Design a protein around this ligand. Structure first.
Ligand SMILES: *[C@@H]1O[C@H](CO)[C@@H](O)[C@H](O)[C@H]1NC(C)=O
Ligand SMILES: *[C@@H]1O[C@H](CO)[C@@H](O)[C@H](O)[C@H]1NC(C)=O
Ligand SMILES: *[C@@H]1O[C@H](CO)[C@@H](O)[C@H](O)[C@H]1NC(C)=O
Ligand SMILES: *[C@@H]1O[C@H](CO)[C@@H](O)[C@H](O)[C@H]1NC(C)=O
Ligand SMILES: *[C@@H]1O[C@H](CO)[C@@H](O)[C@H](O)[C@H]1NC(C)=O
Ligand SMILES: *[C@@H]1O[C@H](CO)[C@@H](O)[C@H](O)[C@H]1NC(C)=O
Ligand SMILES: [Ca+2]
Ligand SMILES: [Ca+2]
Ligand SMILES: [Ca+2]
Ligand SMILES: [Ca+2]
Ligand SMILES: [Ca+2]
Lengths: 388, 323, 478, 98
């Protein structure tokens, strides 16, 4: 990347490691997990790191296990503002034939619904875990070979491990490394025109297939042409200097100007596209400090404080109820509060003096002496002290 | 015909290309006209709070003018003088009223002294320009086709679909105004019903009926004669439109303002004529003829002599020179 | 109410079965393999289990089409993508697996198209390795290079220099013509075809080069290698994201640092990381000019290209049109614009889509100066839209391995029984060719090659300079 | 430099008669302003305006080559399926004819 390293060093990509020997980095070829992505209006990312766009309005497939049928995901797209070139995600559906052949549904809030029934988070069934992440975004986790992310305002993600190498089929592609074949319709052939690919994965015949995917909706709104230039010109400004050498910014710029001109309110459309870039800069290792009173600093409530890189393990009061559980989580970004304070259910965070217990689900108050005939139990400071 | 006409007359009122009126008290910029498949231009109108301010023409991507009653026209953000002719857009003043011509791009805008946006547009965009002045078709009932493309029954949410926002200001759904007329009814409906009625009774208006129908014009006035206190002049805005609408159809009317007790505002030295030539023979002018075969246009102009010189009428003897 | 049509049945939600996959899960041909959502059915009418809906017609069988380019295809109908056929044997086309001939390019002054297909930006000024074979653990047969001068900002400047090193040879080209500095041993595979605008240039069974006499470099490889190369164009493996594998054997992300690894002179200038922006030097803060170039670059989306817009995405070739001509100060020669569309038109032709987009107000390309030497004006030359590149001549009478189907440019056409010779600009009868047929067998027009090096005893040599019916004697080793 | 074609080897006859210093200052004035992109006509037209004036004084000139303002004439010999090709771009032919 335009800088020198001595011999014997071992830098590590996200995927694997490489070592310098005789001016020749040696490298492994072991697979590493893919990430389909939906965000903004209609901007997709395949598992093979392709980018494209398809502004269709129907229930489309997004991913599916295709040699066996361990799961299947289904997006649902709608027009999302006055323009025709603004088609955001409303809701995604998930399906697990391995458990009841149930039907999960992520909704336009941070809500979820199993078989029509709304559900409080968390939802530890046998395999799949669903819990909040920052208390503003859901995170499904089936097994250890699957993750998800929030579909409230449309930033769906996935995480597939290499056990699904090349054995899926959908809009997100084969998960085979090859970036080119990803426009392969279900009828088994690589299509060049994207307008044929997306409409080949629709689920309802009554839906209108489109004929042209426009690239410059700023024409239909000439007022935003100026603002879309200076706004996402910070994407190349040296604020993001640290991750030009991590991931190509040119599309994350290309997908701004299609959003800021198209959507109803360009304020947050701007500041939900910049974060699309920082989130991928951080997924490789580079964190950036790009928040200002002008550049969309979020307003953590009075109980919480803004924070750049923090630990969502010692935050929730449920943690003290189940401290033994592992938290193999990263150094995330969001609204936390200082270490002396832990999170309460009611939006404020509190010391561990009045941090309740969650024994058997039951939310006991900080002082609740508690016993059947044969056991003896009490909640002291967050942990549930049982005896016999 | 081979042309069209839109008009935003008085306060909050609208007249599309096809005889369809309504009211709208907007809050921000809105798209008047322009293509829908592809836009070589876009005429735009800004509303401060219900009341209107500016006409704007954005010529694709690169050029922008923001004229208004203030007359302090600007290009981008740099205030320019007037007249002005860049990029094939002559920005002139005709009959004491301001004009914006785009004959290459097929439109002619203008404003009057009071503030009444008008848009003349060719026949090239028949079944094209979809916006706030509606499509240029023959029909008049189907000319609410939203930015999605949806025939709507409300003349209000339609105009809110065709909103357009800036970084300087993002704008929201405006609200319909809560009419205070509903309680202060009194005598105002019994004595002032006549000024809306004289569109139908007086002979000078009793002859456009085979060409147009005053039934909407009288319908839209009766709701605005009630907020203004103590004045018959509140009828002449809705009436003044009806004059021009019949004029555009190929059948002009004459001298109607003689007894109407309302003349449209103009600066000193001039008052409202009807059908004055646009090629006003002025003072510092070359005596040439039979090139101005243009159609005849309404607007205030000087007396018989009293030639024009820099926005005023002055007698022919006192024509200056220049160096 | 409405009693629905005979071939399909009205369905009803049962009160017990949550899985009322009824009207909401309306199976058409698109959604059959797919999986569908359903809360509960509706009061609709619905095709039977072994039948579906098809454009308001409940088509009986599972024979419904196999859509490509949003167009119908009956079962058994075939298509041609690249070098492969492919037929929907059922609902899914199964395609062949004959990998096709890849193709680099140098679109404009500073861009590069890899084999697997990857446009990227690299303004350099030193000499660079376009592609080679000496890569890691291989012999190192051919070492095509490229060298630019004054080309970091595209302009009327930036004359290229190309030095290609195969079979121990050194043939190179710049300033319109090719130049041999060291002839290679096996002259047999060598071949040069100055047909039209181009210099088609074979070098073997699995190699070829093209040059538009101005800037374009489009080397063409065969199935033989399949990951035996590296350089700027990448590795030729099918995988498209590993075409940034620098010489130090790792993938980069910023291609300006990629090509800096591949320069020859390791002490000349590494190029400078430019601040990215959608407007180059001149178009920067000159919004007016940007829109006259933007519009004029929308010829790449015009009525005449509508066939090729479907196949070959123009969004790559567009971004170059706006990048070059901003930088380039076209004054007398508008070639930094006219050359980018021909680089799109040719790629449209390789997919079988001829185009005639070139008129008199727009990049004329006359051909009339050639029908000039002769006092008589026979004028057999013509700017033919896209004519074959591999035709027959007095110099090359035989049919050659033809890597390029057709090409734009000025081409001769006179009535039959007259074959072309380049030295005499006019066409001419067959017999006027300096052709050679010694002891019967049909071959070239007297190539300058020493046949039969294998066997001394069988050393029965027969050269032919122009016509001579001659056979030389072999010098014995003893 | 590119406007010094108005002082080139081929114009040396006309440089003696018709002063090129006027027609030069226009060449530099237009093409600075003009953003020639696809059509280099705001340059190619100024020299023809000098070449014609050279011809009126009896000095034909052929200054127009293939890398420089080509002016083909081949689209006209097109409608006829037969290609007679009787049309030609040449120097300076009689402006008047029958
Ligand atoms: C209106 O014009 C005056 C005089 O030029 C100027 O001072 C004022 O700022 C203008 N206001 C608007 C609304 O542009
Ligand atoms: C107007 O355009 C619409 C939409 O393209 C088309 O359906 C209709 O036939 C057109 N009507 C006329 C009168 O051209
Ligand atoms: C395609 O499938 C058909 C039917 O199974 C088979 O006959 C044919 O050999 C296959 N062709 C290829 C290229 O795989
Ligand atoms: C020239 O092009 C025309 C039109 O495509 C074609 O009909 C003709 O065969 C071509 N002739 C030659 C000599 O290539
Ligand atoms: C053919 O080759 C012989 C040598 O054997 C030479 O003497 C003769 O001049 C050549 N003829 C021609 C026409 O080149
Ligand atoms: C060019 O035109 C001139 C003048 O008509 C004529 O004398 C001459 O023969 C022509 N030359 C050619 C090559 O056509
Ligand atoms: Ca794939
Ligand atoms: Ca209408
Ligand atoms: Ca590769
Ligand atoms: Ca063919
Ligand atoms: Ca003479």
């Amino acid at each position: 990347s335009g800088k020198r390293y001595p011999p014997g060093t071992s830098l590590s990509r996200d995927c694997n490691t490489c070592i310098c020997r005789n001016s020749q980095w040696i490298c492994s070829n072991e697979e590493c997990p893919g990430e389909c992505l939906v965000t903004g209006q209609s901007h997709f990312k395949s598992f093979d790191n392709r980018y494209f766009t398809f502004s269709g309005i129907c229930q489309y497939l997004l991913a599916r296990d295709c040699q066996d049928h361990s799961f299947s995901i289904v997006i649902e797209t709608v027009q999302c503002a006055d323009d025709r070139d603004a088609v955001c995600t409303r809701s995604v559906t998930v399906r697990l034939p391995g458990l009841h052949n149930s039907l999960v549904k992520l909704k336009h809030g941070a809500g979820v619904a199993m078989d029509g029934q709304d559900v409080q988070l968390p939802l530890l069934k046998g395999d799949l875990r669903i819990q909040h992440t920052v208390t503003a975004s859901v995170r499904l986790s089936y097994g250890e070979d699957l993750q998800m992310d929030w579909d409230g305002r449309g930033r769906l993600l996935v995480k597939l491990s290499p056990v699904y190498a090349g054995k899926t089929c959908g809009l997100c592609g084969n998960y085979n490394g090859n970036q080119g074949d990803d426009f392969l319709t279900p009828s088994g052939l690589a299509e060049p025109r994207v307008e044929d690919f997306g409409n080949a994965w629709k689920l309802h015949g009554d839906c209108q297939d489109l004929q042209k995917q426009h690239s410059d909706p700023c024409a239909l709104n000439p007022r935003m042409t100026r603002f879309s230039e200076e706004a996402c010109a910070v994407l190349t400004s040296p604020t993001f200097e640290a991750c030009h050498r991590a991931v190509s910014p040119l599309p994350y710029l290309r997908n701004c100007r299609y959003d800021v001109c198209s959507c109803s309110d360009g304020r947050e459309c701007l500041c939900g596209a910049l974060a699309s870039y920082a989130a991928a800069c951080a997924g490789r290792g580079v964190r950036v400090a790009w928040r200002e009173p002008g550049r969309c600093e979020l307003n953590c409530p009075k109980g919480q404080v803004y924070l750049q890189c923090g630990t969502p393990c010692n935050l929730t009061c449920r943690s003290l109820s189940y401290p033994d559980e592992e938290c193999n989580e990263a150094c995330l970004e969001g609204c936390f509060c200082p270490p002396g304070l832990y999170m309460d259910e009611r939006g404020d965070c509190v010391p561990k003096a009045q941090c309740p217990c969650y024994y058997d689900g039951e939310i006991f108050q900080p002082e609740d002496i508690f016993s059947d005939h044969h056991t003896m139990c009490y909640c002291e400071d967050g942990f549930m002290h049982c005896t016999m | 015909s081979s042309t069209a006409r839109c008009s935003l007359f008085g306060s909050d009122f609208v007249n599309t290309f096809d005889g369809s009126m309504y009211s709208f008290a907007g809050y921000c910029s809105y798209l008047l006209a322009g293509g829908c498949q592809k836009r070589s231009f876009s005429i735009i109108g800004d509303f401060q709070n219900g009341k209107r301010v500016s006409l704007s023409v954005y010529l694709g991507e690169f050029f922008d003018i923001h004229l208004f009653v203030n007359g302090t026209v600007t290009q981008g953000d740099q205030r320019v003088s007037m007249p002005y002719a860049s990029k094939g857009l002559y920005l002139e003043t005709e009959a004491g009223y301001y004009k914006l011509s785009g004959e290459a791009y097929g439109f002619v805008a203008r404003i009057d002294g009071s503030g009444n946006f008008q848009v003349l547009l060719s026949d090239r965009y028949f079944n094209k320009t979809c916006g706030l002045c509606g499509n240029f078709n023959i029909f008049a009932e189907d000319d609410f086709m939203t930015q999605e493309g949806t025939l709507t029954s409300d003349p209000y949410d339609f105009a809110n679909s065709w909103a357009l926002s800036s970084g300087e200001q993002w704008c929201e759904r405006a609200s319909p105004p809560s009419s205070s007329c509903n309680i202060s009814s009194g005598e105002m409906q019994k004595g002032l019903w006549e000024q809306c009625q004289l569109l139908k009774s007086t002979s000078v208006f009793a002859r456009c009926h085979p060409l147009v129908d005053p039934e909407p014009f009288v319908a839209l006035c009766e709701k605005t004669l009630c907020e203004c206190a103590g004045g018959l002049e509140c009828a002449c805005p809705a009436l003044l439109e009806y004059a021009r609408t019949c004029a555009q159809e190929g059948m002009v009317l004459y001298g109607w303002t003689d007894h109407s007790a309302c003349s449209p505002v103009c600066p000193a030295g001039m008052e409202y004529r009807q059908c004055v030539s646009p090629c006003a023979r002025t003072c510092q002018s070359l005596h040439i003829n039979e090139m101005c075969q243009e159609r005849c246009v309404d607007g205030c102009s000087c007396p018989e002599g009293q030639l024009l010189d820099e926005g005023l009428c002055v007698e022919s003897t006192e024509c200056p020179c220049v160096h | 109410s409405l009693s629905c049509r005979p071939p399909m049945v009205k369905l009803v939600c049962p009160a017990d079965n949550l899985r009322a996959e009824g009207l909401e899960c309306t199976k058409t041909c698109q959604n059959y393999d797919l999986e569908c959502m359903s809360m509960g059915c509706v009061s609709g009418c619905l095709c039977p289990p072994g039948m579906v809906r098809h454009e308001n017609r409940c088509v009986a069988l599972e024979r419904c089409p196999c859509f490509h380019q949003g167009k119908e295809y009956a079962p058994g109908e075939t298509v041609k993508i690249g070098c492969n056929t492919c037929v929907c044997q059922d609902r899914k086309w199964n395609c062949t697996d004959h990998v096709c001939d890849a193709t680099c390019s140098t679109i404009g002054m500073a861009h590069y198209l890899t084999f697997d297909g990857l446009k990227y930006l690299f303004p350099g000024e030193c000499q660079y390795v376009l592609v080679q074979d000496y890569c890691g653990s291989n012999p190192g047969t051919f070492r095509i290079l490229v060298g630019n001068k004054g080309c970091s900002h595209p302009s009327v400047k930036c004359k290229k220099r190309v030095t290609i090193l195969v079979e121990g040879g050194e043939i190179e080209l710049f300033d319109g013509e090719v130049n041999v500095k060291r002839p290679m041993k096996d002259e047999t595979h060598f071949e040069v075809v100055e047909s039209g605008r181009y210099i088609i240039l074979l070098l073997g069974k699995a190699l070829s080069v093209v040059w538009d006499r101005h800037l374009s470099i489009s080397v063409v490889l065969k199935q033989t290698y399949q990951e035996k190369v590296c350089g700027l164009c990448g590795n030729f493996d099918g995988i498209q994201n590993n075409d940034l594998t620098s010489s130090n054997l790792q993938v980069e992300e910023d291609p300006v640092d990629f090509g800096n690894s591949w320069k020859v002179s390791s002490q000349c200038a590494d190029t400078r990381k430019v601040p990215l922006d959608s407007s180059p030097a001149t178009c920067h803060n000159n919004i007016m000019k940007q829109t006259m170039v933007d519009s004029s670059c929308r010829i790449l989306t015009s009525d005449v290209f509508q066939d090729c817009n479907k196949l070959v995405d123009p969004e790559p070739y567009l971004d170059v049109c706006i990048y070059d001509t901003c930088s380039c100060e076209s004054i007398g020669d508008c070639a930094c614009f006219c050359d980018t569309i021909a680089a799109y038109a040719h790629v449209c032709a390789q997919h079988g889509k001829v185009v005639t987009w070139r008129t008199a107000t727009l990049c004329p390309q006359s051909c009339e100066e050639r029908n000039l030497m002769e006092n008589g004006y026979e004028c057999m030359w013509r700017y033919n839209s896209c004519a074959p590149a591999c035709q027959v001549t007095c110099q090359h009478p035989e049919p050659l391995a033809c890597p390029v189907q057709c090409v734009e440019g000025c081409h001769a056409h006179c009535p039959p029984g007259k074959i072309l010779d380049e030295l005499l600009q006019t066409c001419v009868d067959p017999e006027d060719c300096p052709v050679c047929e010694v002891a019967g067998r049909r071959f070239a027009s007297g190539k300058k090659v020493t046949l039969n090096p294998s066997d001394p005893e069988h050393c029965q040599i027969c050269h032919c300079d122009v016509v001579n019916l001659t056979c030389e004697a072999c010098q014995e080793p003893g």
